[PDB]
Design a protein around this ligand. Structure first.
Ligand SMILES: *C(=O)[C@@H](NC(=O)/C(=N/OC)c1csc(N)n1)[C@@H]1N=C(C(=O)O)C(=C)CS1
Length: 252
């Protein structure tokens, strides 16, 4: 049952949409359908999938795993160290995940995205959007060739976390561990990942919060996405919108 809902009150005037889906039943809750079906760059929400890829290929092994920091200077102080998978994920550290993915052959990534039905599965622009001048701080998942809709994000999440892929449960559980977020509410478990990008073509943000909600035996897989024209609208902002929706509409 697809129910069209209105979560405009939690968006505080920001343009976007949301999709929550419970697979135990078939409750699909959709705010702004056109947007929910529209493919965009996943941005850093792809770090959910790239983490599983690195674990599956044995590039990394646990939430402590390191990628061999070489001392390069970065403006974010937390990038300037041999950080663990948990920290790189939570800091959304780009050099860590770029080095990780560049240890995997492209055909393995193609096959994994295909299996996950990950949007357009287009990794043709492997090095990413080089015209932004950022060089090696780029990749196919950052405002580049790969694109996925909020609906497909939710479907991918459900496939992964319901056990419907060949990824090892041990690796799934590492992801659950590092995806958990503190929502000041112990009656629900919230997991997710932000993403932030700007579509220079359309002059709109791609701001994401994608994840899952556990609330008394029921699990909801969700994706919240803004396409606002205001450049101040980021992943973290959209995560706050997501948390407001969860507290207002997915409590009990
Ligand atoms: C993933 O989406 C990352 N975003 C970027 O690569 C950006 N790089 O440019 C500085 C970016 C930041 S603002 C903008 N228009 N582009 C990392 N993920 C976000 C996130 O998690 O939402 C961050 C919090 C840090 S950057």
């Amino acid at each position: 049952s697809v129910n069209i809902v209105d979560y405009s009150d939690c968006f505080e005037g920001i343009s976007g949409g949301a999709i929550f889906c419970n697979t135990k039943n078939k409750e699909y809750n959709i705010y702004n359908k056109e947007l929910i079906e529209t493919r965009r760059s996943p941005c850093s929400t792809f770090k959910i999938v790239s983490t599983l890829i690195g674990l599956e290929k044995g590039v990394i092994n646990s939430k402590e795993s390191v990628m061999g920091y070489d001392g390069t200077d970065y403006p974010n102080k937390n990038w300037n160290k041999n950080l663990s998978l948990e920290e790189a994920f939570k800091e959304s550290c780009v050099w860590y995940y770029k080095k990780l993915i560049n240890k995997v052959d492209a055909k393995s990534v193609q096959n994994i995205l295909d299996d996950l039905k990950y949007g357009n599965c287009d990794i043709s622009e492997w090095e990413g959007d080089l015209k932004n001048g950022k060089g090696h701080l780029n990749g196919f998942w950052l405002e580049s060739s790969l694109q996925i809709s909020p609906k497909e994000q939710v479907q991918t999440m459900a496939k992964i976390f319901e056990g419907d892929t060949n990824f090892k449960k041990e690796h799934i559980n590492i992801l659950r561990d590092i995806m958990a977020i503190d929502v000041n509410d112990a009656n629900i478990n919230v997991y997710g990942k932000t993403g932030t990008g700007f579509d220079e073509k359309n002059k709109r943000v791609d701001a994401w919060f994608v994840g899952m909600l556990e609330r008394e035996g029921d699990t909801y897989y969700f994706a919240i996405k803004s396409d606002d024209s205001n450049k101040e609208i980021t992943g973290p902002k959209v995560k706050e919108i997501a948390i407001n929706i969860i507290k207002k509409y997915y409590s009990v």
